[PDB]
Design a protein around this ligand. Structure first.
Ligand SMILES: *[C@@H]1O[C@H](CO)[C@@H](O[C@@H]2O[C@H](CO)[C@@H](O[C@@H]3O[C@H](CO)[C@@H](O)[C@H](O)[C@@H]3O)[C@H](O)[C@H]2NC(C)=O)[C@H](O)[C@H]1NC(C)=O
Ligand SMILES: *[C@@H]1O[C@H](CO)[C@@H](O[C@@H]2O[C@H](CO)[C@@H](O[C@@H]3O[C@H](CO)[C@@H](O)[C@H](O)[C@@H]3O)[C@H](O)[C@H]2NC(C)=O)[C@H](O)[C@H]1NC(C)=O
Ligand SMILES: *[C@@H]1O[C@H](CO)[C@@H](O[C@@H]2O[C@H](CO)[C@@H](O[C@@H]3O[C@H](CO)[C@@H](O)[C@H](O)[C@@H]3O)[C@H](O)[C@H]2NC(C)=O)[C@H](O)[C@H]1NC(C)=O
Ligand SMILES: *[C@@H]1O[C@H](CO)[C@@H](O)[C@H](O)[C@H]1NC(C)=O
Ligand SMILES: *[C@@H]1O[C@H](CO)[C@@H](O)[C@H](O)[C@H]1NC(C)=O
Ligand SMILES: *[C@@H]1O[C@H](CO)[C@@H](O)[C@H](O)[C@H]1NC(C)=O
Lengths: 104, 130, 114, 130, 130, 104, 114, 104, 114
């Protein structure tokens, strides 16, 4: 199983609404781990089971989707959030990651 | 025996639905409160007519109908869920429910490797018998 | 529950990569799956394998001939061992702990070849 | 053990009803729409008191009652249909649910013909050992 | 494998209730008309934490829940009573549902005593071969 | 299993109602094949499952019966219908025929 | 679906009766039972045997030691073979096709002895 | 399983109400055979399944109890009733008797 | 249904006690358990063993190495046999018949040692 993440690169300003797409070949139905990662560091979490946050993650991110289509949305962007982003399915082994989505 | 489809037509493709086994590996989808509704547990697929097996399968359902209907006549159960369990029990009683007569056609014991098990230990005392 | 990686910084080719993922604040039992991730630089991440707290480890098919995971509950740590190493696995390595509600990443170790 | 009927009387004849297995060979009677109603599926017959087996059978139903009643006390099922299936499973677990110790009283393996299977091949090499 | 309890606490004592098997030896208590009501058939007891088995048992119920919930998702039965019967059938099909390859890891045949059975009768003709 | 067919011979005229009886030793419950056969020829059908005609058989014949008693009835006879008649059970093998019933 | 019988007109005693029942307009598969009937003259008919389109042929007990039925789906025909023949089976023979809705008779072959 | 019978000896007069107790270590729930026995003789019955008399036993005795506690009561005593008394459980083998209770 | 005991009045030590419990008015079949009771003098009674009318006799654990019960349906009687006798079983012995509705005691036999 492999996923497709769109689009490969972004750039925006403060005040818009940003949307990153993770799309599966099959149906997995809630299984999406969204993550955030600055360069050199280790990745933090954002969103597991495609909809629910983790404790320590700000209240402007949001996730969604099921079946085969999953999205992540960032509302009212700040200049903190420039980091690569990722998604992982958990539906069966071997689990698979996307190909990143740069934000600037 | 082979199944020879004697129907007027055969749709050679099988557009199916079923449920998705281990429908929730990690995550909270297995918890009923959070999971899908009844309508969203199905997966779908497409099978082609390799070896004409689909056309073979269509006739088979046909031939089952009489026997199935007669079975339902004899029970007082309102909903019958146990047909495959009874088939499994009948498999077991057919093979091991009775006496296994070795070399017989109804006993499934193969001793060729068991023959080599007793024939390598023929020489542990028969060859060194000085 | 906190995780921490350790290991060397150099390997030689045709050798064995050894990694120790030490857990602190708890123990390796529970409804926790314990996964390994690697990332060569400027890229996406590549899933390696996992273990559960009872047995029968799980893997990735492009590595499934030369990767071993092993859990020690007494000292409560992992040994991940890669064998027949090549020059295409210099990366920052991570041990993730994945659960039904969340998970947690570690700090990651830089591993090169020469 | 034998059953010794200790009842005041015994009706020595058994006037019975049951259902007719393969109740519709050829024809349309197997199709529910055309077939008999619920009341018309029974066949009848008459059994005589050969070997006093009927009188034997009457006492047996009597002796079952206590154990049967205690079984019904312990279940929460409203209608119990599975007693014979559970008996069949218990038969299988009694014989092959564990380790078969050969020559033991609970392992049903007979090797006399298996002895002649290994004793005719004693002479394939032991007699031509020149 | 061992069960390592990863719960916040463990109540080490097990205060239980169950039903009393052969609940009426002699006497009239087995007859439903005379016997106890539904509420009076239970016995009670106290188990201690020997070998930490109670704490072991508590975690196990926890680990079953996901798989149990997924099973209930796939059936259309309103009340499921057959889980243990299906487990028993699976035990039987795992061991004798197929071909038993002797000396294989999935065939449970031990022939050491069977070896002494064929080795005492080696000398009935091999030693008196004058 | 054997059947008994009554009566062995008939003769009548045009305008009456004729009735031939096939009676089984056991209970078979709908299984009666009624046939018609002129001399030298091969037998046609009349009535299978003891009640329903076959396509090509006129609308004045009728069958009936179940259990152990089965009848055939011909209303408003014509001088075509002089032929031997038969009945067969289908309930279990070996299936068995009657002993004919001449009509003239 | 139409049926047609063929065979010789004479046999000799202590010999083998061979009959070919050829079907045209279809094929031997389905919910069709395929029966054989004989009728010595001025009488009732006598049921012989049958076949289904998968296997295990069925019979009549007074003939069950010396009667064989065999189906060929390629040419789509029957061979019925009677062995150890006597002078008590000269008859007009028929192959009937019996189904859940109807059936069909054939044309019948006169077979004598001498 | 063992029972405890109280008290070991009694004496009373005519007109009172006498009560003898049989108490089980476990729960057996109706299984108590109460008996009566004069010296030298063989014991008669009184009460089986802890509540019901036997035919031939007078109408002033009464039994009772269940679970683990069982009693026997004699109302309006007469000078016939001086005899040892006993109780037996029937719930599982080996069945066990009490230790007597003298009445005078 | 009436019961009656019989046997000797004396035994010797290191010997065999034999008791015959004969039933009259019926037969040993039914929903009747057939128990044996003993009573050394001025005491309570001591349960010994029982039989049912099919097989597998039941016992008392302090006697379970040296007590045998056997039923004969033809003459309809019991043989109770005690072996390795001592001086601590001189008693008046009884055979009781216990049922789902009632039971019946016998007449009891005095047995001593010397
Ligand atoms: C079986 O045992 C496991 C323990 O390994 C139980 O898992 C724990 O379940 C609770 C349920 O509330 C989880 O609590 C949640 O924690 C998060 C993070 O602190 C918090 O945001 C929520 O408000 C809630 O408190 C807990 O995290 C979870 N632990 C793990 C490791 O998953 C499980 O509940 C037991 N099974 C059943 C059926 O209860
Ligand atoms: C199974 O067979 C046994 C026979 O061995 C049946 O037992 C008998 O059942 C009747 C039921 O009324 C008992 O009758 C009662 O007798 C006493 C004493 O005479 C009397 O006081 C009552 O008024 C009533 O008539 C009878 O004693 C009893 N016999 C024995 C030896 O226990 C039993 O009923 C049969 N099973 C079923 C389920 O019916
Ligand atoms: C299983 O397959 C068989 C095919 O071998 C189906 O049998 C056919 O069923 C139809 C049902 O209507 C029969 O049609 C009837 O034909 C007669 C004669 O033409 C006509 O008078 C009726 O009006 C009706 O059209 C057809 O004859 C029959 N074919 C054979 C050989 O019996 C059967 O229906 C299939 N099973 C199920 C459960 O549907
Ligand atoms: C069967 O074969 C093995 C060969 O690996 C042999 O060592 C063994 O002794 C044999 N079994 C017995 C019971 O002798
Ligand atoms: C058992 O008996 C047959 C005799 O028909 C013999 O040919 C065969 O070889 C024997 N089986 C084995 C495994 O040797
Ligand atoms: C197996 O062992 C017993 C020893 O008690 C021996 O008498 C017997 O003959 C052996 N079985 C066979 C089939 O030879």
């Amino acid at each position: 199983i492999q996923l497709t993440q769109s689009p490969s690169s972004l750039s925006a300003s403060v005040g818009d609404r940003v949307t990153i797409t993770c799309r599966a070949s099959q149906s997995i139905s809630t299984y999406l781990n969204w993550y955030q990662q600055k360069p050199g560091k280790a990745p933090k979490f954002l969103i597991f089971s495609a909809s629910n946050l983790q404790s320590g993650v700000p209240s402007r991110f949001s996730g969604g989707g099921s079946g085969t289509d999953f999205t992540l949305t960032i509302s009212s962007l700040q200049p903190e959030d420039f980091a690569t982003y990722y998604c992982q399915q958990t539906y069966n082994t071997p689990r698979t990651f996307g190909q990143g989505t740069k934000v600037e | 025996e082979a199944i020879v489809n004697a129907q007027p037509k055969c749709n050679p493709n099988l557009h199916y639905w079923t449920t998705q086994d281990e429908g929730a590996a990690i995550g909270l989808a297995w918890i009923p409160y959070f999971g899908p509704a009844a309508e969203g547990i199905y997966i779908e697929g497409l099978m082609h007519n390799q070896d004409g097996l689909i056309c073979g399968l269509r006739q088979l359902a046909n031939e089952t109908t009489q026997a199935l209907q007669l079975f339902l006549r004899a029970t007082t159960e309102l909903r019958t869920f146990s047909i495959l369990n009874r088939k499994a029990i009948d498999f077991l009683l057919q093979r091991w429910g009775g006496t296994c007569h070795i070399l017989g056609p109804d006993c499934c014991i193969e001793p060729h490797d068991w023959t080599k098990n007793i024939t390598d230990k023929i020489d542990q005392i028969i060859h060194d018998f000085v | 529950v906190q995780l921490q990686e350790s290991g060397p910084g150099l390997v030689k080719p045709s050798g064995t990569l050894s990694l120790t993922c030490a857990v602190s604040g708890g123990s390796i039992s529970g409804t926790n799956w314990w996964t390994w991730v690697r990332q060569p630089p400027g890229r996406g991440l590549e899933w390696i394998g996992e273990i559960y707290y009872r047995g029968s480890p799980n893997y990735n098919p492009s590595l499934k001939s030369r990767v071993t995971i092993s859990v020690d509950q007494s000292k409560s740590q992992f040994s991940l061992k890669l064998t027949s190493v090549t020059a295409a696995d210099t990366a920052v390595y991570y041990c993730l702990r994945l659960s039904h509600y969340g998970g947690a990443w570690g700090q990651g170790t830089l591993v090169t070849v020469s």
